[PDB]
mmCIF file of N, CA, C and O in Angstrom:
data_model
loop_
_atom_site.group_PDB
_atom_site.id
_atom_site.type_symbol
_atom_site.label_atom_id
_atom_site.label_comp_id
_atom_site.label_asym_id
_atom_site.label_seq_id
_atom_site.Cartn_x
_atom_site.Cartn_y
_atom_site.Cartn_z
ATOM 1 N N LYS A 535 -4.289 -48.568 44.334
ATOM 2 C CA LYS A 535 -5.658 -48.310 44.754
ATOM 3 C C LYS A 535 -5.677 -47.607 46.107
ATOM 4 O O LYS A 535 -4.639 -47.407 46.745
ATOM 5 N N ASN A 536 -6.890 -47.205 46.512
ATOM 6 C CA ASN A 536 -7.214 -46.580 47.802
ATOM 7 C C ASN A 536 -6.496 -45.248 48.037
ATOM 8 O O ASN A 536 -6.410 -44.786 49.179
ATOM 9 N N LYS A 537 -5.986 -44.611 46.984
ATOM 10 C CA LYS A 537 -5.330 -43.312 47.081
ATOM 11 C C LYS A 537 -5.699 -42.499 45.851
ATOM 12 O O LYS A 537 -5.612 -43.006 44.730
ATOM 13 N N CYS A 538 -6.110 -41.247 46.051
ATOM 14 C CA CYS A 538 -6.446 -40.396 44.915
ATOM 15 C C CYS A 538 -5.157 -39.886 44.277
ATOM 16 O O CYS A 538 -4.307 -39.291 44.949
ATOM 17 N N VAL A 539 -4.985 -40.182 42.988
ATOM 18 C CA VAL A 539 -3.786 -39.839 42.233
ATOM 19 C C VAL A 539 -4.203 -39.358 40.849
ATOM 20 O O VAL A 539 -5.381 -39.375 40.488
ATOM 21 N N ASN A 540 -3.212 -38.934 40.071
ATOM 22 C CA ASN A 540 -3.419 -38.519 38.690
ATOM 23 C C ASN A 540 -3.143 -39.697 37.762
ATOM 24 O O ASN A 540 -2.003 -40.162 37.657
ATOM 25 N N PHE A 541 -4.186 -40.175 37.091
ATOM 26 C CA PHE A 541 -4.081 -41.322 36.203
ATOM 27 C C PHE A 541 -4.036 -40.870 34.749
ATOM 28 O O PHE A 541 -4.583 -39.826 34.386
ATOM 29 N N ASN A 542 -3.373 -41.672 33.917
ATOM 30 C CA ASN A 542 -3.263 -41.422 32.479
ATOM 31 C C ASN A 542 -3.563 -42.735 31.761
ATOM 32 O O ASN A 542 -2.656 -43.522 31.480
ATOM 33 N N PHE A 543 -4.842 -42.966 31.464
ATOM 34 C CA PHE A 543 -5.275 -44.173 30.763
ATOM 35 C C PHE A 543 -5.533 -43.815 29.302
ATOM 36 O O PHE A 543 -6.666 -43.569 28.884
ATOM 37 N N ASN A 544 -4.436 -43.789 28.530
ATOM 38 C CA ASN A 544 -4.424 -43.507 27.086
ATOM 39 C C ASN A 544 -5.033 -42.144 26.757
ATOM 40 O O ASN A 544 -5.742 -41.984 25.760
ATOM 41 N N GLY A 545 -4.756 -41.149 27.604
ATOM 42 C CA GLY A 545 -5.202 -39.786 27.404
ATOM 43 C C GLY A 545 -6.255 -39.329 28.394
ATOM 44 O O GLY A 545 -6.380 -38.122 28.639
ATOM 45 N N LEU A 546 -7.015 -40.263 28.966
ATOM 46 C CA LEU A 546 -8.051 -39.915 29.934
ATOM 47 C C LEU A 546 -7.417 -39.515 31.260
ATOM 48 O O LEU A 546 -7.116 -40.372 32.098
ATOM 49 N N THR A 547 -7.214 -38.215 31.459
ATOM 50 C CA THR A 547 -6.496 -37.696 32.614
ATOM 51 C C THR A 547 -7.482 -37.118 33.622
ATOM 52 O O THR A 547 -8.350 -36.316 33.262
ATOM 53 N N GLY A 548 -7.345 -37.528 34.875
ATOM 54 C CA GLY A 548 -8.171 -37.012 35.940
ATOM 55 C C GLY A 548 -7.456 -37.128 37.265
ATOM 56 O O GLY A 548 -6.252 -37.382 37.321
ATOM 57 N N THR A 549 -8.212 -36.932 38.344
ATOM 58 C CA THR A 549 -7.661 -37.034 39.691
ATOM 59 C C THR A 549 -8.750 -37.538 40.623
ATOM 60 O O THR A 549 -9.780 -36.877 40.788
ATOM 61 N N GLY A 550 -8.523 -38.698 41.224
ATOM 62 C CA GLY A 550 -9.495 -39.271 42.132
ATOM 63 C C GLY A 550 -9.093 -40.672 42.535
ATOM 64 O O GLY A 550 -8.112 -41.234 42.037
ATOM 65 N N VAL A 551 -9.873 -41.227 43.462
ATOM 66 C CA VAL A 551 -9.623 -42.579 43.952
ATOM 67 C C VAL A 551 -10.065 -43.589 42.900
ATOM 68 O O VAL A 551 -10.857 -43.283 42.000
ATOM 69 N N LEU A 552 -9.527 -44.801 42.999
ATOM 70 C CA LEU A 552 -9.821 -45.882 42.060
ATOM 71 C C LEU A 552 -10.355 -47.072 42.850
ATOM 72 O O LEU A 552 -9.581 -47.846 43.421
ATOM 73 N N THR A 553 -11.675 -47.217 42.884
ATOM 74 C CA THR A 553 -12.325 -48.345 43.530
ATOM 75 C C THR A 553 -12.927 -49.269 42.479
ATOM 76 O O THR A 553 -13.018 -48.927 41.297
ATOM 77 N N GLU A 554 -13.333 -50.453 42.925
ATOM 78 C CA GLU A 554 -13.881 -51.448 42.016
ATOM 79 C C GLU A 554 -15.312 -51.097 41.621
ATOM 80 O O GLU A 554 -16.086 -50.549 42.412
ATOM 81 N N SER A 555 -15.656 -51.410 40.376
ATOM 82 C CA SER A 555 -16.991 -51.157 39.857
ATOM 83 C C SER A 555 -17.914 -52.327 40.174
ATOM 84 O O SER A 555 -17.503 -53.489 40.164
ATOM 85 N N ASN A 556 -19.183 -52.004 40.444
ATOM 86 C CA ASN A 556 -20.169 -53.006 40.833
ATOM 87 C C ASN A 556 -21.451 -52.901 40.014
ATOM 88 O O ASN A 556 -22.528 -53.244 40.514
ATOM 89 N N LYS A 557 -21.363 -52.437 38.773
ATOM 90 C CA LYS A 557 -22.522 -52.274 37.910
ATOM 91 C C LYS A 557 -22.331 -53.062 36.620
ATOM 92 O O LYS A 557 -21.258 -53.605 36.343
ATOM 93 N N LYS A 558 -23.399 -53.117 35.829
ATOM 94 C CA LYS A 558 -23.375 -53.802 34.546
ATOM 95 C C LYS A 558 -22.611 -52.961 33.530
ATOM 96 O O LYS A 558 -22.671 -51.729 33.538
ATOM 97 N N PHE A 559 -21.881 -53.645 32.650
ATOM 98 C CA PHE A 559 -21.111 -52.987 31.604
ATOM 99 C C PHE A 559 -21.156 -53.835 30.341
ATOM 100 O O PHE A 559 -21.547 -55.005 30.362
ATOM 101 N N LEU A 560 -20.732 -53.233 29.234
ATOM 102 C CA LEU A 560 -20.708 -53.824 27.908
ATOM 103 C C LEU A 560 -19.267 -54.076 27.469
ATOM 104 O O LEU A 560 -18.365 -53.315 27.835
ATOM 105 N N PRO A 561 -19.009 -55.139 26.696
ATOM 106 C CA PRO A 561 -17.647 -55.357 26.176
ATOM 107 C C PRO A 561 -17.195 -54.338 25.137
ATOM 108 O O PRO A 561 -16.008 -54.336 24.786
ATOM 109 N N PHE A 562 -18.083 -53.480 24.637
ATOM 110 C CA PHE A 562 -17.723 -52.416 23.707
ATOM 111 C C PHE A 562 -17.991 -51.043 24.323
ATOM 112 O O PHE A 562 -18.538 -50.143 23.681
ATOM 113 N N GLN A 563 -17.620 -50.878 25.591
ATOM 114 C CA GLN A 563 -17.748 -49.610 26.300
ATOM 115 C C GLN A 563 -16.437 -49.328 27.016
ATOM 116 O O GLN A 563 -15.953 -50.171 27.779
ATOM 117 N N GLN A 564 -15.866 -48.148 26.774
ATOM 118 C CA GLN A 564 -14.563 -47.803 27.327
ATOM 119 C C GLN A 564 -14.642 -46.899 28.550
ATOM 120 O O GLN A 564 -13.707 -46.901 29.357
ATOM 121 N N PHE A 565 -15.720 -46.135 28.712
ATOM 122 C CA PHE A 565 -15.848 -45.250 29.863
ATOM 123 C C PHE A 565 -17.322 -44.969 30.113
ATOM 124 O O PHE A 565 -18.168 -45.154 29.236
ATOM 125 N N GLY A 566 -17.611 -44.523 31.329
ATOM 126 C CA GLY A 566 -18.963 -44.169 31.706
ATOM 127 C C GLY A 566 -19.026 -42.745 32.213
ATOM 128 O O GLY A 566 -18.091 -42.241 32.836
ATOM 129 N N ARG A 567 -20.152 -42.095 31.933
ATOM 130 C CA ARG A 567 -20.351 -40.703 32.301
ATOM 131 C C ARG A 567 -21.694 -40.533 32.998
ATOM 132 O O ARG A 567 -22.608 -41.350 32.852
ATOM 133 N N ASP A 568 -21.793 -39.453 33.762
ATOM 134 C CA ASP A 568 -22.988 -39.095 34.505
ATOM 135 C C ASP A 568 -23.756 -37.992 33.775
ATOM 136 O O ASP A 568 -23.473 -37.670 32.616
ATOM 137 N N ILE A 569 -24.757 -37.426 34.453
ATOM 138 C CA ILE A 569 -25.536 -36.332 33.880
ATOM 139 C C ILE A 569 -24.692 -35.068 33.752
ATOM 140 O O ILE A 569 -24.922 -34.248 32.853
ATOM 141 N N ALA A 570 -23.699 -34.892 34.622
ATOM 142 C CA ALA A 570 -22.851 -33.708 34.619
ATOM 143 C C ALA A 570 -21.674 -33.811 33.654
ATOM 144 O O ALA A 570 -20.769 -32.971 33.724
ATOM 145 N N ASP A 571 -21.673 -34.825 32.775
ATOM 146 C CA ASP A 571 -20.675 -35.022 31.711
ATOM 147 C C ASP A 571 -19.257 -35.155 32.265
ATOM 148 O O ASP A 571 -18.309 -34.569 31.739
ATOM 149 N N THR A 572 -19.109 -35.930 33.335
ATOM 150 C CA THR A 572 -17.809 -36.207 33.926
ATOM 151 C C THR A 572 -17.548 -37.706 33.908
ATOM 152 O O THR A 572 -18.478 -38.513 33.988
ATOM 153 N N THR A 573 -16.271 -38.068 33.799
ATOM 154 C CA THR A 573 -15.888 -39.471 33.691
ATOM 155 C C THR A 573 -16.079 -40.187 35.024
ATOM 156 O O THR A 573 -15.589 -39.735 36.062
ATOM 157 N N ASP A 574 -16.795 -41.311 34.988
ATOM 158 C CA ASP A 574 -17.103 -42.084 36.184
ATOM 159 C C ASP A 574 -16.402 -43.432 36.240
ATOM 160 O O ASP A 574 -16.135 -43.926 37.338
ATOM 161 N N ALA A 575 -16.098 -44.038 35.094
ATOM 162 C CA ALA A 575 -15.443 -45.338 35.054
ATOM 163 C C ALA A 575 -14.377 -45.334 33.970
ATOM 164 O O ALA A 575 -14.483 -44.612 32.975
ATOM 165 N N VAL A 576 -13.343 -46.149 34.175
ATOM 166 C CA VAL A 576 -12.196 -46.216 33.273
ATOM 167 C C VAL A 576 -11.900 -47.682 32.977
ATOM 168 O O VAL A 576 -11.736 -48.485 33.901
ATOM 169 N N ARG A 577 -11.845 -48.030 31.693
ATOM 170 C CA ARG A 577 -11.482 -49.374 31.266
ATOM 171 C C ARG A 577 -9.968 -49.536 31.279
ATOM 172 O O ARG A 577 -9.230 -48.613 30.924
ATOM 173 N N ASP A 578 -9.514 -50.712 31.692
ATOM 174 C CA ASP A 578 -8.085 -50.994 31.704
ATOM 175 C C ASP A 578 -7.670 -51.516 30.331
ATOM 176 O O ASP A 578 -8.313 -52.429 29.803
ATOM 177 N N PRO A 579 -6.626 -50.949 29.717
ATOM 178 C CA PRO A 579 -6.183 -51.465 28.409
ATOM 179 C C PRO A 579 -5.552 -52.845 28.476
ATOM 180 O O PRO A 579 -5.652 -53.611 27.511
ATOM 181 N N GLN A 580 -4.901 -53.189 29.587
ATOM 182 C CA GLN A 580 -4.207 -54.468 29.692
ATOM 183 C C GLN A 580 -5.081 -55.544 30.335
ATOM 184 O O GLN A 580 -5.383 -56.563 29.707
ATOM 185 N N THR A 581 -5.494 -55.331 31.580
ATOM 186 C CA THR A 581 -6.285 -56.322 32.290
ATOM 187 C C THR A 581 -7.771 -56.128 32.008
ATOM 188 O O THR A 581 -8.204 -55.100 31.482
ATOM 189 N N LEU A 582 -8.551 -57.140 32.370
ATOM 190 C CA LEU A 582 -9.998 -57.139 32.156
ATOM 191 C C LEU A 582 -10.731 -56.585 33.373
ATOM 192 O O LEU A 582 -11.681 -57.187 33.874
ATOM 193 N N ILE M 923 -70.576 -26.320 68.887
ATOM 194 C CA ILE M 923 -69.351 -25.687 68.409
ATOM 195 C C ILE M 923 -68.181 -26.661 68.496
ATOM 196 O O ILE M 923 -67.377 -26.774 67.562
ATOM 197 N N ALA M 924 -68.083 -27.399 69.606
ATOM 198 C CA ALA M 924 -66.999 -28.360 69.786
ATOM 199 C C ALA M 924 -67.121 -29.562 68.859
ATOM 200 O O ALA M 924 -66.106 -30.195 68.552
ATOM 201 N N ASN M 925 -68.333 -29.892 68.408
ATOM 202 C CA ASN M 925 -68.490 -30.966 67.436
ATOM 203 C C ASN M 925 -68.133 -30.512 66.027
ATOM 204 O O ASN M 925 -67.623 -31.311 65.235
ATOM 205 N N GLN M 926 -68.391 -29.245 65.698
ATOM 206 C CA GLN M 926 -68.012 -28.726 64.390
ATOM 207 C C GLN M 926 -66.524 -28.421 64.307
ATOM 208 O O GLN M 926 -65.958 -28.416 63.208
ATOM 209 N N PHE M 927 -65.876 -28.165 65.445
ATOM 210 C CA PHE M 927 -64.442 -27.900 65.434
ATOM 211 C C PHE M 927 -63.638 -29.187 65.302
ATOM 212 O O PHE M 927 -62.639 -29.224 64.575
ATOM 213 N N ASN M 928 -64.053 -30.248 65.997
ATOM 214 C CA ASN M 928 -63.361 -31.526 65.906
ATOM 215 C C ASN M 928 -63.593 -32.224 64.574
ATOM 216 O O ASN M 928 -62.754 -33.029 64.157
ATOM 217 N N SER M 929 -64.706 -31.936 63.899
ATOM 218 C CA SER M 929 -64.951 -32.479 62.571
ATOM 219 C C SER M 929 -64.313 -31.647 61.468
ATOM 220 O O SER M 929 -64.280 -32.097 60.317
ATOM 221 N N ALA M 930 -63.810 -30.453 61.786
ATOM 222 C CA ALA M 930 -63.170 -29.620 60.775
ATOM 223 C C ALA M 930 -61.693 -29.951 60.611
ATOM 224 O O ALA M 930 -61.165 -29.853 59.499
ATOM 225 N N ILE M 931 -61.015 -30.338 61.694
ATOM 226 C CA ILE M 931 -59.616 -30.740 61.585
ATOM 227 C C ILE M 931 -59.507 -32.113 60.930
ATOM 228 O O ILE M 931 -58.493 -32.428 60.293
ATOM 229 N N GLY M 932 -60.544 -32.943 61.059
ATOM 230 C CA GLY M 932 -60.563 -34.230 60.387
ATOM 231 C C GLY M 932 -60.690 -34.137 58.880
ATOM 232 O O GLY M 932 -60.279 -35.065 58.176
ATOM 233 N N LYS M 933 -61.248 -33.037 58.370
ATOM 234 C CA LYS M 933 -61.325 -32.827 56.931
ATOM 235 C C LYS M 933 -60.023 -32.294 56.346
ATOM 236 O O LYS M 933 -59.891 -32.231 55.120
ATOM 237 N N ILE M 934 -59.073 -31.886 57.188
ATOM 238 C CA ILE M 934 -57.755 -31.516 56.683
ATOM 239 C C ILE M 934 -56.855 -32.743 56.586
ATOM 240 O O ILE M 934 -55.924 -32.775 55.773
ATOM 241 N N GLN M 935 -57.121 -33.771 57.397
ATOM 242 C CA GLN M 935 -56.266 -34.954 57.412
ATOM 243 C C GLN M 935 -56.464 -35.813 56.169
ATOM 244 O O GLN M 935 -55.528 -36.495 55.738
ATOM 245 N N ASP M 936 -57.660 -35.798 55.581
ATOM 246 C CA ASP M 936 -57.895 -36.558 54.360
ATOM 247 C C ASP M 936 -57.554 -35.780 53.095
ATOM 248 O O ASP M 936 -57.224 -36.392 52.073
ATOM 249 N N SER M 937 -57.631 -34.448 53.137
ATOM 250 C CA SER M 937 -57.245 -33.644 51.984
ATOM 251 C C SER M 937 -55.732 -33.571 51.825
ATOM 252 O O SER M 937 -55.237 -33.465 50.698
ATOM 253 N N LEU M 938 -54.989 -33.626 52.931
ATOM 254 C CA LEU M 938 -53.534 -33.624 52.863
ATOM 255 C C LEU M 938 -52.961 -35.000 52.555
ATOM 256 O O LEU M 938 -51.787 -35.097 52.180
ATOM 257 N N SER M 939 -53.753 -36.060 52.708
ATOM 258 C CA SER M 939 -53.293 -37.416 52.442
ATOM 259 C C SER M 939 -53.750 -37.953 51.092
ATOM 260 O O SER M 939 -53.236 -38.987 50.650
ATOM 261 N N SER M 940 -54.696 -37.286 50.429
ATOM 262 C CA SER M 940 -55.180 -37.765 49.138
ATOM 263 C C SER M 940 -54.324 -37.233 47.994
ATOM 264 O O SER M 940 -53.761 -38.006 47.211
ATOM 265 N N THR M 941 -54.215 -35.912 47.883
ATOM 266 C CA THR M 941 -53.465 -35.274 46.814
ATOM 267 C C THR M 941 -52.316 -34.458 47.394
ATOM 268 O O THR M 941 -52.285 -34.145 48.587
ATOM 269 N N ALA M 942 -51.364 -34.118 46.525
ATOM 270 C CA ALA M 942 -50.194 -33.336 46.902
ATOM 271 C C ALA M 942 -50.135 -31.996 46.175
ATOM 272 O O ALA M 942 -49.065 -31.384 46.094
ATOM 273 N N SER M 943 -51.264 -31.530 45.645
ATOM 274 C CA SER M 943 -51.310 -30.266 44.919
ATOM 275 C C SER M 943 -51.453 -29.057 45.834
ATOM 276 O O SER M 943 -51.400 -27.924 45.344
ATOM 277 N N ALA M 944 -51.628 -29.263 47.139
ATOM 278 C CA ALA M 944 -51.764 -28.146 48.067
ATOM 279 C C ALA M 944 -50.428 -27.506 48.415
ATOM 280 O O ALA M 944 -50.403 -26.338 48.818
ATOM 281 N N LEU M 945 -49.325 -28.236 48.267
ATOM 282 C CA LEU M 945 -47.986 -27.732 48.573
ATOM 283 C C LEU M 945 -47.248 -27.291 47.317
ATOM 284 O O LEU M 945 -46.035 -27.485 47.199
ATOM 285 N N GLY M 946 -47.964 -26.701 46.358
ATOM 286 C CA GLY M 946 -47.350 -26.268 45.115
ATOM 287 C C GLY M 946 -46.437 -25.067 45.254
ATOM 288 O O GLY M 946 -45.566 -24.866 44.401
ATOM 289 N N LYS M 947 -46.615 -24.265 46.306
ATOM 290 C CA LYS M 947 -45.748 -23.110 46.505
ATOM 291 C C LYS M 947 -44.380 -23.522 47.037
ATOM 292 O O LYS M 947 -43.367 -22.904 46.692
ATOM 293 N N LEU M 948 -44.331 -24.559 47.874
ATOM 294 C CA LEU M 948 -43.061 -25.053 48.387
ATOM 295 C C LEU M 948 -42.325 -25.928 47.382
ATOM 296 O O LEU M 948 -41.102 -26.068 47.482
ATOM 297 N N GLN M 949 -43.041 -26.521 46.424
ATOM 298 C CA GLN M 949 -42.396 -27.361 45.422
ATOM 299 C C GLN M 949 -41.650 -26.536 44.381
ATOM 300 O O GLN M 949 -40.649 -27.004 43.828
ATOM 301 N N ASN M 950 -42.111 -25.315 44.107
ATOM 302 C CA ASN M 950 -41.443 -24.458 43.137
ATOM 303 C C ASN M 950 -40.154 -23.853 43.675
ATOM 304 O O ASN M 950 -39.330 -23.383 42.882
ATOM 305 N N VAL M 951 -39.961 -23.848 44.994
ATOM 306 C CA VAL M 951 -38.718 -23.341 45.564
ATOM 307 C C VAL M 951 -37.591 -24.349 45.369
ATOM 308 O O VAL M 951 -36.473 -23.983 44.990
ATOM 309 N N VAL M 952 -37.876 -25.632 45.596
ATOM 310 C CA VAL M 952 -36.852 -26.665 45.471
ATOM 311 C C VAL M 952 -36.551 -26.945 44.002
ATOM 312 O O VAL M 952 -35.399 -27.197 43.626
ATOM 313 N N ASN M 953 -37.575 -26.886 43.145
ATOM 314 C CA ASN M 953 -37.380 -27.207 41.734
ATOM 315 C C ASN M 953 -36.645 -26.099 40.990
ATOM 316 O O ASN M 953 -35.996 -26.368 39.972
ATOM 317 N N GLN M 954 -36.729 -24.857 41.469
ATOM 318 C CA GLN M 954 -36.008 -23.770 40.817
ATOM 319 C C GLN M 954 -34.534 -23.755 41.196
ATOM 320 O O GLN M 954 -33.691 -23.392 40.369
ATOM 321 N N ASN M 955 -34.203 -24.139 42.431
ATOM 322 C CA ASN M 955 -32.803 -24.231 42.826
ATOM 323 C C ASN M 955 -32.130 -25.464 42.239
ATOM 324 O O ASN M 955 -30.918 -25.445 41.993
ATOM 325 N N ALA M 956 -32.889 -26.537 42.012
ATOM 326 C CA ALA M 956 -32.330 -27.724 41.379
ATOM 327 C C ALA M 956 -32.135 -27.530 39.882
ATOM 328 O O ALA M 956 -31.294 -28.205 39.279
ATOM 329 N N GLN M 957 -32.896 -26.622 39.268
ATOM 330 C CA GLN M 957 -32.731 -26.348 37.846
ATOM 331 C C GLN M 957 -31.624 -25.335 37.586
ATOM 332 O O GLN M 957 -31.040 -25.328 36.497
ATOM 333 N N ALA M 958 -31.323 -24.479 38.564
ATOM 334 C CA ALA M 958 -30.256 -23.500 38.388
ATOM 335 C C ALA M 958 -28.882 -24.129 38.579
ATOM 336 O O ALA M 958 -27.922 -23.744 37.904
ATOM 337 N N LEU M 959 -28.769 -25.096 39.491
ATOM 338 C CA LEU M 959 -27.494 -25.767 39.708
ATOM 339 C C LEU M 959 -27.213 -26.815 38.641
ATOM 340 O O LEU M 959 -26.047 -27.126 38.375
ATOM 341 N N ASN M 960 -28.260 -27.369 38.023
ATOM 342 C CA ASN M 960 -28.060 -28.337 36.952
ATOM 343 C C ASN M 960 -27.623 -27.658 35.661
ATOM 344 O O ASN M 960 -26.865 -28.242 34.880
ATOM 345 N N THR M 961 -28.089 -26.431 35.421
ATOM 346 C CA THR M 961 -27.687 -25.709 34.219
ATOM 347 C C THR M 961 -26.268 -25.167 34.347
ATOM 348 O O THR M 961 -25.572 -25.008 33.336
ATOM 349 N N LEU M 962 -25.818 -24.897 35.574
ATOM 350 C CA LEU M 962 -24.480 -24.350 35.776
ATOM 351 C C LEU M 962 -23.403 -25.400 35.528
ATOM 352 O O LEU M 962 -22.345 -25.091 34.969
ATOM 353 N N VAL M 963 -23.653 -26.649 35.932
ATOM 354 C CA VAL M 963 -22.679 -27.715 35.707
ATOM 355 C C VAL M 963 -22.743 -28.283 34.299
ATOM 356 O O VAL M 963 -21.833 -29.022 33.902
ATOM 357 N N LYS M 964 -23.786 -27.964 33.535
ATOM 358 C CA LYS M 964 -23.885 -28.416 32.154
ATOM 359 C C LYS M 964 -23.167 -27.498 31.176
ATOM 360 O O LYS M 964 -22.976 -27.886 30.019
ATOM 361 N N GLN M 965 -22.770 -26.303 31.603
ATOM 362 C CA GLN M 965 -22.074 -25.364 30.735
ATOM 363 C C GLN M 965 -20.568 -25.580 30.713
ATOM 364 O O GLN M 965 -19.862 -24.841 30.018
ATOM 365 N N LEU M 966 -20.059 -26.564 31.452
ATOM 366 C CA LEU M 966 -18.644 -26.905 31.387
ATOM 367 C C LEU M 966 -18.301 -27.754 30.172
ATOM 368 O O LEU M 966 -17.114 -27.933 29.878
ATOM 369 N N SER M 967 -19.300 -28.278 29.465
ATOM 370 C CA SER M 967 -19.074 -29.068 28.265
ATOM 371 C C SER M 967 -19.017 -28.225 26.999
ATOM 372 O O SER M 967 -18.713 -28.763 25.929
ATOM 373 N N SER M 968 -19.297 -26.928 27.092
ATOM 374 C CA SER M 968 -19.282 -26.063 25.925
ATOM 375 C C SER M 968 -17.849 -25.676 25.562
ATOM 376 O O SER M 968 -16.905 -25.868 26.332
ATOM 377 N N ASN M 969 -17.697 -25.114 24.364
ATOM 378 C CA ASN M 969 -16.391 -24.712 23.858
ATOM 379 C C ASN M 969 -16.146 -23.215 23.938
ATOM 380 O O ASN M 969 -15.003 -22.807 24.174
ATOM 381 N N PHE M 970 -17.199 -22.405 23.743
ATOM 382 C CA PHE M 970 -17.142 -20.935 23.735
ATOM 383 C C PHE M 970 -16.148 -20.406 22.702
ATOM 384 O O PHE M 970 -15.445 -19.421 22.935
#
């Protein structure tokens, strides 16, 4: 954490910092997007 | 003359505080630049 790196979460490849999420989410949601169609949140395959 | 002048500026203070339709020329400047930048970032989702 606290460093912008290249992540590979089962194909979801990007570059940016990884901070904790503080919003509501669903147990059947894997990622979140904004109006500009960019990935905003990433679900962890192993941990919750 | 001084009574009609001081009562004329008071009629601008209530017209500018009741409705916001008097600044329609300045609202179209901000809304056109916000619509041009929103359409530019939405074209990255296309395939071409």
